[model samples]
Target chain A: GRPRPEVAHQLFRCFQYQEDMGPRASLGRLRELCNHWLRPALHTKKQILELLVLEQFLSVLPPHVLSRLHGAPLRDGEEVAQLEG
Target chain B: GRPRPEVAHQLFRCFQYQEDMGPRASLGRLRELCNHWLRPALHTKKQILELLVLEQFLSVLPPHVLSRLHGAPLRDGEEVAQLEG
Candidate 1:
């Protein structure tokens, strides 16, 4: 028998979706973490690699769906400066 | 030079924390998903394995800290009845 496609979709929806507020809120949270303040800091050491795993998932998000945040996307750059390495 | 222990602490703190509402709220959401209603459903096939990865992280949460949710722990059991597997 075919696996319940709805159940599989439910699991996929858990990863990313916007129709319902739960997944939307989670993506919003991810956008905050993706902000400029953390961008450079997240680039340092294995932290960058750790975050890259997430980028692999997030970077390919379809623009139509990713547009929900109105220009907020993961790994944006700015003219950021820092005092420490 | 030694890595800034404070920075590392900040990273670890992201995994679980309470004083700040951010991490605290994430834990609360996890507890909601851990309820008895979803427990059996989450046990099916790869879904169970997926949730177990989280259990590895959540189950070890210290009792004193876990107490913040007032007994809302991950993976509780119930005498649930269902129509199909």
Candidate 2:
């Protein structure tokens, strides 16, 4: 299929809905959903949309959590918990 | 930290770089990278950027593959190979 610009509207709406969830809880929940549900379910659009929500949340994370995610590895749920903090 | 507007520019540049990789190879490669490497690397920005690149590739994929990803299960690398095709 051809690439259509209408992709923009669904993309926008997907995360705009998630944005209302607020940042800390939003980022953690999306990350958890990506690992547990979306990956297993193969809901490609929702998976991608969740990552976009994470990126939007990244800009709001305190410098430490932001920098840590930008660099160091998250050792499973440990760092993920901090990111949610 | 406050959400900085400049975040938009960096996010744009990240995916723009991957768009140069083209679609079919781009989607499959990003998927492989996410499962094999990026998941281990904890390079959060790159991981998110790769997912965005895959989103851009989604529309161009033939309807069967696109719909499969959007709806059902991939099972394993087998379905992934078909997507790459």
- Strongest candidate by lDDT: 2
Residue A46 in model 2: lDDT: 33
lDDT of 1 by residue, A11-62 (tens): 3334332334432243333333333222333254223323322223333335
Interface root mean square deviation per prediction: 15.0, 17.7
lDDT of 2 by residue, B36-79 (tens): 32232433543543343344344244566456666544223234
Model 2, TM vs. native? 0.21
Alpha-carbon RMSD of each model: 16.2, 19.0
Let me know the DockQ for model 2: 0.02
For every prediction, compared with the true complex, DockQ reads: 0.03, 0.02
Q: What's the lDDT for all of these models?
A: 0.31, 0.38
**Candidate 2, residue A47: CA error in Å?**
0.7
Kindly report which residue pairs in candidate 1 clash with one another: none
Model 2's number of clashes is 0
lDDT of 1 at A57: 30
